[PDB]
Design a protein around this ligand. Structure first.
Ligand SMILES: O=c1ccn([C@@H]2O[C@H](COP(=O)(O)OP(=O)(O)O[C@H]3O[C@H](CO)[C@@H](O)[C@H](O)[C@H]3O)[C@@H](O)[C@H]2O)c(=O)[nH]1
Ligand SMILES: O=c1ccn([C@@H]2O[C@H](COP(=O)(O)OP(=O)(O)O[C@H]3O[C@H](CO)[C@@H](O)[C@H](O)[C@H]3O)[C@@H](O)[C@H]2O)c(=O)[nH]1
Lengths: 364, 365
């Protein structure tokens, strides 16, 4: 059992951070998770009994106090596990100076479409020189790393894991929740991505206007990084279409399995390739049908017409056609959903994922 | 010529900074000197008409180190980044990579365990090795220490500090005035012109004075530039412990160094850790004064003992005393030595030759 210093730049619970909860939990007796900012993610790590600490930039390491503090701390640990891009910069420096092995867990697709050239060069060059191992969350992320110049031999793909038991909800609780939302007689499409242009909420909204009138959508998530312009653009879009009473924003929520159960279809509409797609697996584990954008790691998670649907990124009419399909062919749709549950339960079970992480770390 | 972005971590006018004025001055039409702090060095650069900018660490990846992001930003406008100090090499390395600009490292330090922490040595060596197209060392002793620490020999070229030969002339009347104003006209005056740090060894000179006759006095010229206020106290206490209140004077940081050197009878360099080059030494020589220096580092390239100056064992006050007494007694030899020193130094460290060596080195990248 090695002492591990996990690093993550964000104090907010984005996908990489929620993923980090499961990655770190088995190591929590001897681990520390270091954050470069405070927020609800700190709270979450406490609730799960994972030791955590916020490093700050308050005061040769006079240029970057945070980096110095992390370097100091890293001396007390056997391994540095960088979970985000800024965390890789800091972890790489600490890996050199404290002479500690570095793992980089890659949750992004390092492509020009997602990031500036400088960010790509930095991540790729730091990973190549300092990382003993690059764990990619999907073959698509592995691929994009390599196309950006990253070293193939450093890469292993390990999917996000999920605690299977969290994804059941009673018929009775479903009914109540649908009641409380005021959607009991709607066909409900749930979108569970943080609000940001590339997560494509506006595509779902465009599709709604081509759907039957009983279809409403719940947008779950907040603008995690100050994309408040986008949120305003959504509200205006909703208004310009006839959609004011057909779209509810619920903000960031914690009861995701329950809200997914309350939906009739879960939709993922990213307009740029999704590296993995947690909401996709989560939908499947809740036994709900899911439609996703046909790119990135979604293609690995979904076989169209078998365990979900895939539509061309950016194309709202296709999304509408799939919604209509789910309304009309309910028995097909229920079998698809049910197949999804069975498959995803095997593939993405946190127990198997944890075993893979353990084996990979032991094999260094 | 090429647009050069010079970088130097300090706003204080230390050796490396004084040397940088001369290095940068010919390129001033297209160059910029970036300081990572404000101070008297900014004023000096302004006075020599060399564009200067103070980068501060107030505000993507740039959030961790804004100063770095500003420098990286600035580097796109230049053809070459010229790092003059260690922290400037960290930042210049980063900027060399991101902005895609070649980097030169001008090495004014002896990178050895005695002078620096292990981390500093590793950082400096690895960055130079990976990012610098050239390491200009100030002395063979600096080149050597670099190589011994892991630095790549083939990156190194030695180029000494240069000096404006004309600045070292002082009237015998201005000299008499000055000795008078200091209250030292009847003394044998030993001047020390190093900044106040323990390794510059002012305390050795003070111990030496206790083994000298009472008409021997010292002027300590310089300041604690890097927080060595405890050393300043220690010196004063030392002075009080021995009987020396009347025989040692501190003048703080002075600009009139040629004149002050003229007003001494002997210039003393007494560093207790190896000196990388030693500007004061050459400066003394250019003033036609005799100089005793500590036998280590670049001082040994500068001084042949008995010929153009004297050398003594680092940390040994009795040896330094013996040389002071000898300079009192053997005035004719001493003046010959001092005079020889000026002829040599004036050929060997003329800023004109040195600017030329630097221009060819840069030119051939
Ligand atoms: O109000 C909300 C909204 C979302 N979620 C959860 O937030 C996560 C969102 O995940 P996702 O959009 O997949 O993550 P990203 O934030 O985009 O994170 C990155 O890293 C993830 C983990 O590898 C990948 O799945 C993503 O593709 C990648 O962009 C899911 O677990 C949701 O259940 C909440 O808990 N509450
Ligand atoms: O009150 C004072 C005292 C000194 N000086 C000047 O300051 C310089 C001090 O030079 P030095 O002791 O050589 O510089 P360091 O600060 O030690 O700088 C480093 O870099 C120098 C330049 O390469 C080398 O000569 C040194 O060995 C090296 O340690 C000389 O020009 C002095 O004339 C002043 O202007 N005013």
């Amino acid at each position: 059992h090695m002492k591990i210093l996990f690093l993550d730049q964000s104090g907010k619970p984005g996908g990489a951070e929620l993923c980090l909860i499961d990655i770190a939990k088995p190591y929590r007796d001897r681990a520390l998770v270091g954050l470069f900012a405070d927020g609800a993610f700190k709270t979450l790590l406490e609730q799960h009994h994972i030791p955590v600490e916020v490093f700050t930039n308050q005061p040769l390491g006079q240029l970057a106090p945070l980096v110095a503090k992390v370097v100091q701390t890293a001396h007390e640990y056997d391994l540095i596990y960088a979970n985000t891009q800024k965390a890789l910069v800091v972890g790489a420096i600490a890996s050199f100076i404290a002479r500690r092995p570095l793992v980089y867990h890659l949750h992004d697709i390092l492509s020009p479409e997602h990031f500036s050239q400088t960010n790509l060069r930095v991540a790729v060059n730091l990973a190549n020189r300092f990382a003993s191992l690059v764990i990619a969350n999907s073959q698509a992320s592995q691929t994009a790393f390599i196309q950006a110049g990253g070293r193939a031999e450093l890469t292993k793909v390990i999917y996000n894991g999920f605690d299977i038991n969290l994804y059941k909800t009673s018929p009775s609780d479903i009914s109540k929740l649908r009641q409380q939302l005021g959607v009991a007689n709607n066909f409900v499409v749930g979108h569970f991505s943080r609000l940001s242009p590339w997560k494509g909420q506006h595509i779902l909204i465009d599709a709604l206007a081509q759907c039957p009138p009983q279809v409403t959508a719940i947008l779950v998530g907040d603008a995690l990084f100050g994309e408040q312009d986008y949120v305003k653009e959504l509200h205006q879009q909703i208004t310009r279409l006839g959609l004011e009473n057909r779209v509810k924003f619920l903000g960031f929520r914690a009861d995701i399995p329950q809200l997914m159960a309350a939906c009739d279809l879960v939709a993922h509409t990213s307009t740029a390739p999704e590296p993995f797609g947690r909401v996709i697996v989560e939908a499947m584990l809740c036994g709900k049908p899911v439609v996703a954008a046909k790119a990135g790691g979604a293609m690995e998670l979904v076989e169209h017409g078998v365990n979900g649907f895939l539509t061309t990124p950016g194309e709202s009419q296709e999304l509408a056609n799939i919604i209509n399909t789910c309304i009309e062919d309910t028995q097909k749709t229920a079998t698809i959903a049910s197949n999804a549950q069975a498959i995803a339960s095997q593939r993405f079970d946190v127990v198997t994922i944890n075993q893979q992480i353990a084996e990979t770390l032991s094999s260094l």
